[PDB]
Paper text:
The 1.6 Å structure of AtClpD N-terminal domain (residues 79–233) revealed a α-helical structure, having 61% helical content. The domain is made up of seven helices: α1 (E85-L101), α2 (T106-E118), α3 (I132-D144), α4 (I170-M186), α5 (P191-V203), α6 (S207-L215) and α7 (M219-K231). Also, unlike in AtClpC1, the two halves of AtClpD NTD do not form the typical four-helix motif repeats. The fact that there are helix breaker residues such as a Pro and two Gly within this stretch supports the experimental evidence for the presence of loop instead of a helix. The presence of longer middle loop and the absence of a helix in the stretch corresponding to α3 of AtClpC1 NTD make AtClpD NTD very different from any known Clp chaperone NTD structures and perhaps might attribute its functional significance of having to recognize specific substrates during stress conditions, without the involvement of any adaptor proteins. When the structure of AtClpD NTD is aligned with AtClpC1 NTD, we realize that the long middle loop comes directly over the region which may otherwise contribute to ClpS1 interaction. Therefore, AtClpD not binding to AtClpS1 or AtClpF could at least partly be due to the presence of the long middle loop in AtClpD NTD which would sterically prevent any such interaction.
In this context, the plant caseinolytic protease (Clp) complex plays an important role in degradation of accumulated and misfolded proteins in chloroplasts wherein the chaperones aid in ATP-dependent unfolding of protein substrates to be degraded by the associated protease machinery. The structured, mature forms of AtClpC1/C2/D consist of three distinct domains such as a short N-terminal domain (NTD) and two ATPase domains, a feature very similar to bacterial ClpC proteins. The N-terminal domain of ClpC1 is known to perform the regulatory function of substrate recognition, either directly or indirectly through the adaptor proteins ClpS1/ClpF for which it becomes a binding platform161718, whereas no adaptor proteins have so far been reported for ClpD. Here we report and analyse the crystal structures of AtClpC1 residues 94 to 238 and AtClpD residues 79 to 233 (hereafter mentioned as AtClpC1 NTD and AtClpD NTD respectively) that correspond to the ClpC NTD of eubacteria.
Author numbering: 75 to 155, 160 to 232
């Protein structure tokens, strides 16, 4: 995407990002926080074995998210202050993740930022939101990070 901020992001990565916006909107949100990004990544991944081969699926992930943030008290950490769904802004935590993804990709001497780089970012530099969802799903976040790194090897 030439001389865009997302120029080096792959087609898959961009799709996951757009999906994060859609997922957030479905939940009645006006900004994409990191749990939403997690949803976008899950929605995007076409692995037949589920997200990062984990058996996680989007419907289950969506239930978890709704439950955690919407069925009881709201999250004090997510009150940061759009005419179509792809104009929905990203939270400071989410932006941090994207920056981490870029950094990791550069460190690895990769030409692109893939969803896997975003996942590594998500699972290393976020506000704890992704972890809460994974915990609810019974998943091990560090194993998922490893799986993402494994994918990037080919």
């Amino acid at each position: 995407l030439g001389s865009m901020v997302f120029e080096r992001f792959t087609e898959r990565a961009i799709r996951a990002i757009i999906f994060s916006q859609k997922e957030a909107k479905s939940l009645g949100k006006d900004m994409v926080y990191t749990q939403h990004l997690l949803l976008g990544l899950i929605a995007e991944d076409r692995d037949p074995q589920g997200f990062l081969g984990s058996g996680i699926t989007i419907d289950k992930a969506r239930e978890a998210v709704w439950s955690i943030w919407d069925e009881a008290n709201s999250d004090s950490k997510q009150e940061e202050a759009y005419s179509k769904s792809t104009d929905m802004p990203f939270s400071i935590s989410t932006k941090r993740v994207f920056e981490a993804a870029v950094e990791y990709s550069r460190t690895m001497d990769c030409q692109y930022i893939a969803p896997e780089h975003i996942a590594v970012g998500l699972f290393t530099v976020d506000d704890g939101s992704a972890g809460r969802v994974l915990k609810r799903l019974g998943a091990n976040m560090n194993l998922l990070t490893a799986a993402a790194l494994t994918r990037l090897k080919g």
